[PDB]
């Protein structure tokens, strides 16, 4: 037995979608994955799901490698591309089942993809400029939402966005760049989380190497070293010649990762240095690149100019903790965030929220061309493409029409995964975007999407729910290519 | 059992009470507790009990004396 | 709910199997092996150590019973009968609820009372030859024929009263049972010192040794 093989391929694609459908979105459910030996696997995102999924049917496999190659380009939306492709496949298979030849389907899908990708460029947003302040803060708070830490959350958002914008790079290409490992969390004791303020640079809690440091020195050349200044029994005891030579080269603040010297206090006040222990290697490289220096395997054999410099060093006790304020180096990379509370363990939620805010702000800072989130883009394309098809004229009317209808599967999945009624929310989105083009007065209504925190229609340009333009463009193009490749098989 | 309480526990309490006291303690079918059963007006008939004592014994011994059922 | 019933049935079956062994007048069973050789015995310990039991928990009962009562002398079949009867009596009350913990508490209280009763009933008549005769007869007539037991009681009691001089009970090495295959089974006595299994190729070397010195040393 066996008939209309394309139907079986479409059913396989639909099954692959239904495996991953409910997992889309931050509030998506988890999945249990079992192998032959019975290993455990719990995850939400579908990229690793398809990475570890055991697919058997060839047509489903094709979707698997298309999702995989989608992952290698932008690393996001693989669930969305798979769902869009499956919906397009089922709609096109239906259209074939009412005897429309698939060549017109493919032509209409290609034309609709081109029309939509051209429409994206004319309806995107570039508000992620220096003037975007409230949107950044509320986007960071939506990333930080469902947390009690939101009482002082606005101050945290302000300080974190200020730190990430100040630490911004300037690469050869010119596009803004930000090092993720440059900033890190740092616990504090005493006053609660409501008083956790900004730290202008990287600070390490260690022994006071030199308390007599000037508040703002004229020049603070950071000289990170690994060799310890300990007495033994080019020098037999590496205590004086190394530090004297590195000071004579020009370095002012000489940092030794190892332990301190017994008499180093006298040397470090007359040379503007200090021996700070427990320097993290992941942070040692960060401070070396901030100053502009590099780690030294050995001081023996550079140090006059290779070792980086800073224009001020502060040695003061803050919130019952003395910190080594090696801040404002040559390159703005040295930064840290103080976490006020009792310990690292109960502050896991706030450090995780700070990390996610950093990630989302760094994602929206680059790729200045941005689009609204929460399904606003899908509703906008669905409004555009139906009318465009109706105004197109040729035999590919139904192809583009079903393309427009299939672009509204993502909002349905988002609404389901948010426990809200899918049909009501998608209908509200589509109706809100109806007047976004029908009535030119409601021109600002184009940025209307789902509020996943509650499941209500709301503007997301103000709310800051943002995605890169390139990610969505390549997602749509990959989905259309996969749909064409599958539909051209019989 | 019908009142819902524990079967053996109620009888244990009743027998413990009746052992020390010559009063014919009874069962109260709302709390599973021993009760004097005289002032509560739970009296049952007498001739019924007297006839029952004979009527149970006769059928008991008759059934217990049977042997080798036959297919007549 | 039903596991208890299964255990009850297995214990009752084991009890019923071991019913017709208790007492000197009780009949004796015989054991057959796959090889063909057979053993004829009545003691409960060997019966439980040699029987091929079907039910699993019955095998549990047999194994644990033998393991515990190896310490004392005997009473194995009596123990099995008593545990089977205990289980049956407890079942007659369990069948109408009666959560097993209450039955356990009753069992423990009865054990305490019985221990005190046995403590106050035990009779401490001073030891002599006659009481040892009686104990030997009672412990021997429950494992072998009547007159064979009567013959063997004198030998065993004389050996034991000989041993008793140390004022401390010791066993194993000090009493040795030799085995041989003479037709006249009526011959059964005790020999002091040691009896060696066999000798060597010596034509009338010493025979009546009388006084001797022992060095051996292999």
């Amino acid at each position: 037995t066996g008939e209309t093989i394309r139907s079986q391929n479409v059913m396989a694609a639909a099954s692959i979608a239904n495996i991953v459908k409910s997992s889309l979105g931050p509030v998506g459910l988890d999945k249990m994955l079992v192998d032959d030996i019975g290993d455990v696997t719990i995850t939400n995102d579908g990229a690793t799901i398809l990475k570890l999924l055991e697919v058997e049917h060839p047509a489903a496999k094709v979707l698997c490698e298309l999702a995989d190659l989608q992952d290698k380009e932008v690393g996001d939306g693989t669930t969305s591309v798979v769902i869009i492709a499956a919906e397009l496949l089922k709609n096109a298979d239906e259209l074939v089942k009412q005897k429309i030849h698939p060549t017109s389907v493919i032509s209409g899908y290609r034309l609709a993809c081109k029309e939509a990708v051209r429409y994206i460029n004319e309806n995107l947003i570039v508000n992620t400029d220096e003037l975007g302040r409230d949107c950044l803060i509320n986007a960071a708070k939506t990333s930080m939402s469902s947390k009690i830490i939101g009482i002082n959350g606005d101050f945290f958002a302000n300080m974190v966005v200020d730190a990430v914008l100040a630490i911004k790079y300037t690469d050869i290409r010119g596009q803004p760049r930000y090092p993720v490992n440059s900033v890190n969390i740092l616990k504090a004791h005493g006053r609660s989380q409501m008083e956790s303020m900004l730290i202008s640079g990287y600070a390490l809690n260690c022994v006071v190497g030199s308390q007599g440091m000037p508040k703002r020195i004229v020049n603070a050349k950071i000289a990170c070293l690994d060799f310890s200044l300990q007495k033994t029994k080019r020098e037999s005891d590496i205590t004086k010649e190394r530090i004297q030579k590195i000071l004579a080269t020009g370095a002012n603040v000489i940092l030794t990762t190892g332990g301190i010297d017994d008499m180093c206090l006298k040397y470090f006040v007359e040379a503007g240095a200090m021996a700070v222990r427990r320097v993290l290697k992941r942070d040692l490289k960060r401070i070396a690149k901030a100053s502009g220096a590099t780690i030294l395997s050995t001081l023996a054999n550079f140090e006059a100019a290779m070792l980086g410099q800073a224009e001020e060093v502060v040695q003061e006790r803050i919130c019952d903790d003395e910190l080594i304020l090696i801040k404002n180096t040559k390159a703005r990379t040295s930064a840290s965030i103080i976490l006020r509370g009792a310990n690292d363990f109960m502050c896991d939620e706030m450090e995780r929220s700070l990390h996610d805010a950093l990630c989302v702000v760094k994602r929206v800072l680059e790729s200045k061309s941005v689009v609204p989130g929460g399904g606003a883009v899908e509703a906008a394309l669905s409004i555009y493409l139906e009318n465009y098809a109706t105004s197109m004229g040729s035999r590919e009317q139904l192809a583009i029409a079903e393309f427009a209808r299939s672009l509204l599967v993502i909002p349905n999945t988002l609404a389901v995964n948010a426990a809200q009624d899918s049909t009501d929310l998608v209908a509200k989105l589509r109706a809100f975007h109806n007047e976004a083009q029908v009535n030119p007065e409601r021109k600002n209504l184009k940025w209307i999407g789902l509020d996943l925190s509650n499941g209500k229609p709301r503007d997301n340009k103000q709310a800051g729910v943002f995605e890169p333009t390139i990610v969505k463009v390549k997602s749509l193009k990959f989905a259309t290519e996969a749909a064409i490749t599958i539909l051209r098989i019989d | 059992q019908n009142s819902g309480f524990d079967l053996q526990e109620t009888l244990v309490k009743i027998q413990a009470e009746h052992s020390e006291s010559g009063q014919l303690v009874g069962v109260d079918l709302n709390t599973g507790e021993p009760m004097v059963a005289a002032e509560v007006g739970v009296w049952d008939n007498y001739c019924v009990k007297k006839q029952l004592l004979h009527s149970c014994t006769v059928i008991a011994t008759n059934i217990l004396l049977v042997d080798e059922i036959m297919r007549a | 709910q039903a596991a208890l019933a299964v255990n009850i049935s297995a214990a009752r079956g084991l009890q019923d199997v071991l019913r017709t062994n208790l007492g000197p007048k009780g009949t004796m069973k015989m054991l057959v092996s796959g090889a063909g050789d057979i053993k004829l015995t009545k003691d409960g310990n060997v019966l439980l150590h040699e029987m091929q039991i079907q039910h699993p928990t019955a095998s549990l009962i047999a194994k644990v019973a033998t393991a515990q009562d190896d310490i004392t002398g005997d009473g194995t079949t009596s123990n099995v009968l008593i545990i089977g009867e205990l289980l049956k009596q407890a079942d007659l009350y369990i069948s109408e609820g009666l959560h097993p913990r209450i039955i356990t508490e009753g069992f423990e209280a009865a054990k305490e009372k019985a221990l005190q009763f046995l403590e106050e009933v035990k009779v401490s008549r001073e030891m002599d030859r006659e009481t040892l005769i009686d104990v030997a007869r009672t412990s021997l007539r429950t494992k072998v024929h009547a007159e064979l037991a009567d013959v063997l009681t004198e030998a065993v009691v004389d050996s034991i009263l000989a041993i008793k001089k140390q004022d401390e009970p010791i066993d194993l090495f000090m009493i040795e049972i030799m085995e041989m295959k003479h037709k006249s089974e009526t011959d059964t006595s005790l020999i002091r010192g040691l009896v060696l299994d066999h000798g060597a190729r010596h034509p009338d070397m010493k025979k009546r040794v009388e006084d001797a010195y022992i060095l051996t040393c292999n």
Binding site: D421, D424 | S3, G4 | -
Partner: protein
């Protein structure tokens, strides 16, 4: 006992979806294999021939409920089913049937003595036809959908207000005449009893007319037989026309000779009489049947005061009015595409009539639409934890059984039951008794309907609660029987 609970639960689940104005229709195939569409719970249950004896008990309890309240049977089914299904898990916990029985009895008494504390009653009286018609919209919305209630309430109330004599009201006089034709809006009201005849030799202005109801309705030798038949027919018609008989009714056909004989004495030939008319005529004008055509005697002869044909509805129908009570009988004329939707309309009319009669027995009304149900549930479940002993679990379960009904109404409306019941229960603490569920909104929103006037009866609800509780108690007592 669990099999009986399962049977009652399935029976309740079958008719649960029909609760309220948003009831699903049912495909009803009768014994004689006829198509039938309806949503009324009583109609399907009276057609449902269930087999489990517990189902028999619950259905006959519902029948007794309909006997003296006229409606709410769907409510008692849903309520008793909820009570039994909760009693199922209460028994599964390990409780006894007896103690849950006393708990349910205590809860029922508590509900009965707290019910009269929701006073949203009739305004002034059964009069003010428009006002009471607005009051009578409850059962109309219940059975028929809310689309046609505006006219159905007026048609149903204008007819029952015709004869408000001495405060005594009766149902049997209220009848509905089947008239197919144009749309529903063309339906109207009339006074008396309406049925159609065949011949046109009709006289309108008639004095006291004696109704003649028939128990049994309608070559030389050839000429001799024809003449004999003529003589026999003439003798029969003159026997009919004896004692000055002026009106005659019959379920048979007409004939040219028969109509000639009828017009010989100037008597109308009422023919094609409905099969239901033979004894309703006897009970409405004091008539009686005739074994044949020769023995109409004055002693066994009917008596009607007005016998005239009415052309209302563009159909020829004779209506009897100005009877002995001069207003007792009052029919309702209908108009619709077919009898299928006519049945639901007339059943809604009957429900309105019964609710009005309950109002005659009780001018006291209570809020409806899930208001009183959740109010009683709140009161009972608040009283529950204040009562020590084992009856407390039965009390909370009785409260949950009350909770069940608004959930059923919500899921019939198509909205999420859990969300709306949570919102309604939460608001009822401060948004007091008059709050309740809203039908129109797709979002699960609540709405106060003291202003809406949708208020169900008091005595009917009291009897429904009592009888459903008694039914659940009785079915809980039986243990088993071999089957």
């Amino acid at each position: 006992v669990y099999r009986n609970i399962q049977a009652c639960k399935e029976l309740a689940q079958t008719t649960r979806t029909a609760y309220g104005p948003n009831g699903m229709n049912k495909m009803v195939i009768n014994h004689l294999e006829k198509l039938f569409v309806t949503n009324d719970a009583a109609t399907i249950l009276r057609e449902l021939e269930v087999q489990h004896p517990a189902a028999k008990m619950i259905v006959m309890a519902s029948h007794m409920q309909e006997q003296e309240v006229g409606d709410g049977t769907n409510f008692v089914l849903v309520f008793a089913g909820a009570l039994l299904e909760l009693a199922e898990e209460l028994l599964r916990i390990g409780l006894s049937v007896s103690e849950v029985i006393e708990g349910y009895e205590i809860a029922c008494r508590k509900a009965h003595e707290i019910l009269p504390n929701l006073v949203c009653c009739s305004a002034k009286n059964l009069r003010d036809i428009d006002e009471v018609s607005s009051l009578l919209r409850t059962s109309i919305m219940s059975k028929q959908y809310g689309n046609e209630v505006f006219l159905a309430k007026l048609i149903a109330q204008a007819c029952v207000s015709i004869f408000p004599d001495s405060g005594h009201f009766n149902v049997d006089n209220i009848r509905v005449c089947k008239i197919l034709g144009s749309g529903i809006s063309s339906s109207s009201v009339l006074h008396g009893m309406v049925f159609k005849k065949e011949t046109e030799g009709d006289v309108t202005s008639v004095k006291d007319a004696k109704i003649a109801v028939y128990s049994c309705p309608f070559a030389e030798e050839l000429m001799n037989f024809s003449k004999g038949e003529e003589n026999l027919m003439d003798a029969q018609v003159k026997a009919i026309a004896d004692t000055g008989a002026n009106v005659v009714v019959t379920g048979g056909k007409v004939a040219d000779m028969a109509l000639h004989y009828a017009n010989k004495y100037n008597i109308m030939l009422v023919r094609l009489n409905s099969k239901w008319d033979l004894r309703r005529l006897c009970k409405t004008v004091g008539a009686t049947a005739l074994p044949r055509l020769t023995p109409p005697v004055l002693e066994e002869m009917g008596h009607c005061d007005s016998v005239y044909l009415s052309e209302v509805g563009d159909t020829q129908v004779v209506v009897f009015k100005h009877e002995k009570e001069d207003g007792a009988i009052s029919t309702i004329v209908l108009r619709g595409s077919t009898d299928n939707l006519m049945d639901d309309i007339e059943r809604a009319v009957d429900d309105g009539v019964n609710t009005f009669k309950v109002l005659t027995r009780d001018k006291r009304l209570v809020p409806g639409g899930g208001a009183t149900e959740i109010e009683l549930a709140k009161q009972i479940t608040s009283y529950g934890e204040t009562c020590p002993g084992l009856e407390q679990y039965a009390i909370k379960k009785f409260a949950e059984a009350f909770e069940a009904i608004p959930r059923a109404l919500a899921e019939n409306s198509g909205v999420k039951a859990n969300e709306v019941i949570s919102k309604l229960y939460a608001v009822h603490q401060e948004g007091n008794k008059n709050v309740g569920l809203d039908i129109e909104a797709e979002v699960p929103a609540v709405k106060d309907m003291l202003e809406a006037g949708i208020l169900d009866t008091y005595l009917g609800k009291y009897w429904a609660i009592k009888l459903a509780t008694n039914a659940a108690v009785t079915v809980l007592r039986v243990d088993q029987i071999i089957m």
